[PDB]
Amino acid sequence: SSQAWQPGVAMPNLYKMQRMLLEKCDLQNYGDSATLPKGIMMNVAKYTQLCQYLNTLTLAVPYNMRVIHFGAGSDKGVAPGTAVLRQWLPTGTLLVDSDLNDFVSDADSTLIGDCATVHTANKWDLIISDMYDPKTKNVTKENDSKEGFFTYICGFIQQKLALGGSVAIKITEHSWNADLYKLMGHFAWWTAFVTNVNASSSEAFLIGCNYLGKPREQIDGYVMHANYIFWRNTNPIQLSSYSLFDMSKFPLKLRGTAVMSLKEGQINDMILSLLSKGRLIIRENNRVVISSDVLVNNENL
């Protein structure tokens, strides 16, 4: 293979360059399962492979890093993905997580409610989303770009992602948004990453690597999602848990990436080059303050 010993498979660049039409996703291995190590949950394995892949990219890793994780609750009432992120991230990293339903978490702070109720004063160095509604898996209806939490995520990135920061946002055949693909062109690099443990699913993480705050490439998101599905439809990925057994190089290196505050007028080509290489983060370095909007109602008489 070669591929079976990786944490997963990233969309090859040539598939990004196509102009495919959207088809139904029909995966050959749809129903295969990886053999997980004894007692290990799918969500731990999936997040572990995501982080192993992110270790291969040029993520900025400043002191006093700030990471926010949407869709972090499980139907079990715990947060396995958050637990993996906290293991991966340098000790001391500020980690906030959130979900619609109540759950217990290892994050530094947790907000319960619809993601649209979440507000933050500060900018973030990394945004992870596992948000998903399994109702979208209806093959009897047309597969159009979805709004909902994707509309929130797009605005949140444009308003609250530090220049230089990165994102990993979970999509599927039916859970996707064209504007989010378009926003991938505002990063120095991007891909769609499929974990080897969950390769039987049309799930992927759309990863934007080093945010530039402006279009570097113009992407048509309807077309790009068709390109992604074409890739999946024609490239069966062998289910594999092999990478889970080598955790010796798992921790994210604390690079001490520089953080500066800068005004739009100061973002020259040399700055943009440092951003693009994972060598600079642009944001305020103030205290991290978050909140959840609460709707108040009195239902008496």
Partner: protein
Amino acid sequence: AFAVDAAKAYKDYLASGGQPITNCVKMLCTHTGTGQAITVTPEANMDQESFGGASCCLYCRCHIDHPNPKGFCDLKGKYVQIPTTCANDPVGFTLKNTVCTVCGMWKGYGCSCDQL
């Protein structure tokens, strides 16, 4: 005067044959770590499993106040190493056992401080 005693309730439920709390979050790790009980990153040795701390805390999992005037949690935001022989019930293990304040090992499951 009245306070719910969740610890005693779980101990008695277990002695009566109740199934231990499940879905504690087990971490992947090298299993070449220090073996200390509660750490900022997984530190299981060959004879332990590492778990996300909040998922192994009776008070976190039951949604009840922590028995501590400040309500602080020893486990949330950390990782807990559980002997593999006791990993079927991490919440029971952390409830019933104590960490040596000197070496950070579990009393009776790694602490050698009382040796000659």
